[PDB]
Design a protein around this nucleic acid. Structure first.
Lengths: 123, 203, 214, 200, 135, 123
RNA sequence: ACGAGAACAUGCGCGACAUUCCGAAGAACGCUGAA
């Protein structure tokens, strides 16, 4: 899939004191992505429990705030922002908003889950 | 032969964790609505254990169906030759629609994540852990059926049931209840004899 | 004239329903208790024998069982008349024939939507009274959203007894809704509700329009 | 007789209490640490696990700890009797059930007055204001009749230890001091006599 | 939320557009310096964030859907402080004039709801987050 | 009998502990495989219900999600990673996606069933 | 003007009873509002 290729292009085997860090980026860590993952999980639970074929307005506002969180974590951790540039998550958010359905949102959430899953698998 | 019904509400005074198959530690959720649920097995097991503690205990009840005869009469038995049908039939308590709408009015999720650091003794290095719990103030509507196998035993059985509920309100309901989890409170709506002609007005 | 009255409706599960049976599937799970399935469709099923047995037991207990009963032929005369008898020299046919209840098409569609499995794997345990150790157990159940199409045939052998028979059938159904269907029902499983779509005399000149069971 | 005794009272903060927890909120400050808050009331909350773990560790260190321990199940037998034991072959249910201490409504009214925010910021971390109070409720399950008084003496010792110590956060830097006040200790279930039972 | 001049709608992408407009290369000694709102520094925008979050906390103390009276008074004091901070530093003045925060908070006062206050503060948070991101 | 071959090749005994215990794939149990085998059961029911020689689009997307699940499970547990790498089950998933027929997925399910059955046998 | 003709392998039957995903586990430590 796209996520696997993106992560394997991202991944790098650095050598420090004999030990090997098989890491996408030096600053990438599960919690830094996990904050946005928690927000994604909240909004995904909202859409996945409400059972609406079209994304609700509150969910759209949640996605706007999700873009805000993208920018905020970009400001804090440069690793998160270069990951976002590599993975174009914000562009997928914009596409999801434009489609304004739950199917595209589910596909995007699966794409993000694939990204984090491949990151865990290689790391 | 009459069936008396006891419907009511269970309110979570604290977080309620009932495990079921990053570190989510998932709580049992009803697959249909994906909402949290209190399994009736958990309620019946906790009530039976608490009541069996209240009454005397033989040294080893390893068969688990050799409790005091009141326990077998209420919650059922399986001993060879003497199989007593369980009069109490607890049911799975689903997430109340009133509490669901109350949470949806706010920007509140039905399940919270509680962080526990699990600090060690010799190393003193905290080990992160996350437990999923049902948020405080949620309600589950519970439905219990009692079958009057014998008429003369009903008052004693309901006294035992009320003692069990009194114990359970002072205890937790699954999860790490020994460190602030699963605490519940029962509010009974209506004890009415659904089937039969037994007089359920008193109880 | 032989009159057969058809009662067709839905059996909504209100909790996880586990009617055990010898099960086979792909990647057989650690579960030692899989639900019964209709092999042609692999969907879970409610065997009509389970419904008939539970209803007959509940109705017989309601009517009252003769002390020291060793057989099902020693029940009340109403129970034998309705559910059938096998006594030597006094064989009575079963007026009530309870077919198997298949997984509904509506619930199948509603579970194809939402990407949900028709069955679920409830994880239980059993805290021992001595070692206080939990032994994990897994039970396969049918999710509470599912419904089953149920089909019952009543045989009108005696015209004057039909109203009393349907009173007894209504009593049995009312007991069953408050009771559980086949499973670990004393622990919350198997809760059921009957929603009768129709009661029409499929065969015979008899009319059952005034006849109701719920 | 499996009698259950109840202790209900209050925990009055004395410094800027800080118990961390992973969460985010709209208009969250640039502080590096938020406090754990009850999701329903959005008020700061003291988890029961914090109190239980703090008292367990304080009792273990005060009574005397066996060197080289790797697991919590290797504490004193009294400690395992009180706070539980998962030791394989010696599983012991805990006689202590400590519940989450929520923000008391009296302190809620006090902070509603004077427009005092529940939590302040120290230069940054978020800390519970000194005037706040959390109502605590713990349950003791009587399993052995003779050992109830000894267990309650141990509980009193743990409460005294925590009273002069901190609860979470940077306690050595002045974040966490609290005090315990007891309303009533009554045998809520059973026939045990708890009139002469105190934890302070 | 509110409507900007020339028919622009106040949104988070609008905040992104505004912060993109505010940034310049500012090449000094061969090296660029990312200047936001005439070179507004992180400290002052974070102080403004803290001022906003004071009202945020004081309104989250209340469960009422409408703005509380003291919340509205604190918002008026926020307007006064915004005016004086605009007066003190040209960078803060440029920020306030390009963000219309005084007009937005006036609209919030007129609407008198928690949701509109949250929307306005979310716009402000987007502004500060994008400002720190582009720097 | 590729399944029995790989299971017996990866079959091992805890000789280091000095107490007899059979170890499959460096500690694999059915509990580790539970989530992925339940997912495969879901796909198997979905394909059985449909009357089509070739796999449908929903089946293909669910199989891509199954590949992602394989990667995530490999990341979470070393035992599942050993099982997947030695059994080439994810590569067979890719082969099934290439073939795009109901029969090839039925044969893949047969192979996985044989794998888990022989694993339970040799324990 | 078939070792033939007429003859339901049928009648009663709950895959059911007993069973708490529990027992323990601090969101953590050392971090000056300051040159």
């Amino acid at each position: 899939n796209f996520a696997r290729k993106v992560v394997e292009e991202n991944k790098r085997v650095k050598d420090n004191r004999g030990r090997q860090e098989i890491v996408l980026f030096n600053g990438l860590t599960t919690s830094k992505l996990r904050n946005l993952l928690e927000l994604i999980n909240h909004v995904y639970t909202k859409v996945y429990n409400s059972d609406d074929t079209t994304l609700s307005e509150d969910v759209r506002d949640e996605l706007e705030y999700l873009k805000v969180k993208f920018a905020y974590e970009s400001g804090r951790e440069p690793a998160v922002r270069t990951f976002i540039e590599k993975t174009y998550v914000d562009k997928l958010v914009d596409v999801v908003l434009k489609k304004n359905t739950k199917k595209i949102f589910l596909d995007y959430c699966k794409y993000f889950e694939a990204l984090v899953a491949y990151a865990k698998f290689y790391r | 032969y009459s069936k008396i019904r006891i419907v009511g509400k269970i309110d979570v005074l604290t977080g309620l964790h009932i495990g079921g198959g990053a570190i989510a530690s998932p709580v049992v959720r009803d697959p249909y609505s994906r909402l949290p649920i209190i399994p009736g097995s958990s309620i019946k097991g906790k009530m039976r254990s608490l009541l069996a503690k209240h009454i005397g205990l033989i040294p080893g009840q390893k068969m688990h169906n050799q409790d005091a005869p009141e326990i077998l009469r209420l919650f059922g038995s399986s001993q060879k030759g003497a199989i007593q049908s369980s009069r109490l039939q607890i049911s799975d308590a689903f997430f109340s629609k009133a509490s669901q709408e109350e949470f949806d009015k706010k920007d509140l999720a039905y399940t919270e994540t509680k962080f526990e650091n699990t600090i060690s003794r010799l190393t003193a290095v905290a080990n992160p852990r996350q437990i999923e719990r049902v948020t405080r103030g949620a309600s589950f509507d519970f439905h219990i059926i009692y079958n009057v196998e014998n008429i003369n035993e009903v008052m004693a059985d309901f006294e035992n049931i009320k003692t069990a509920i009194h114990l359970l309100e002072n205890d937790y309901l699954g999860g790490g209840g020994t460190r602030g989890n699963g605490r519940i409170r029962f509010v009974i709506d209506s004890i009415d004899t659904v089937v039969g002609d037994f007089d359920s007005s008193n109880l």
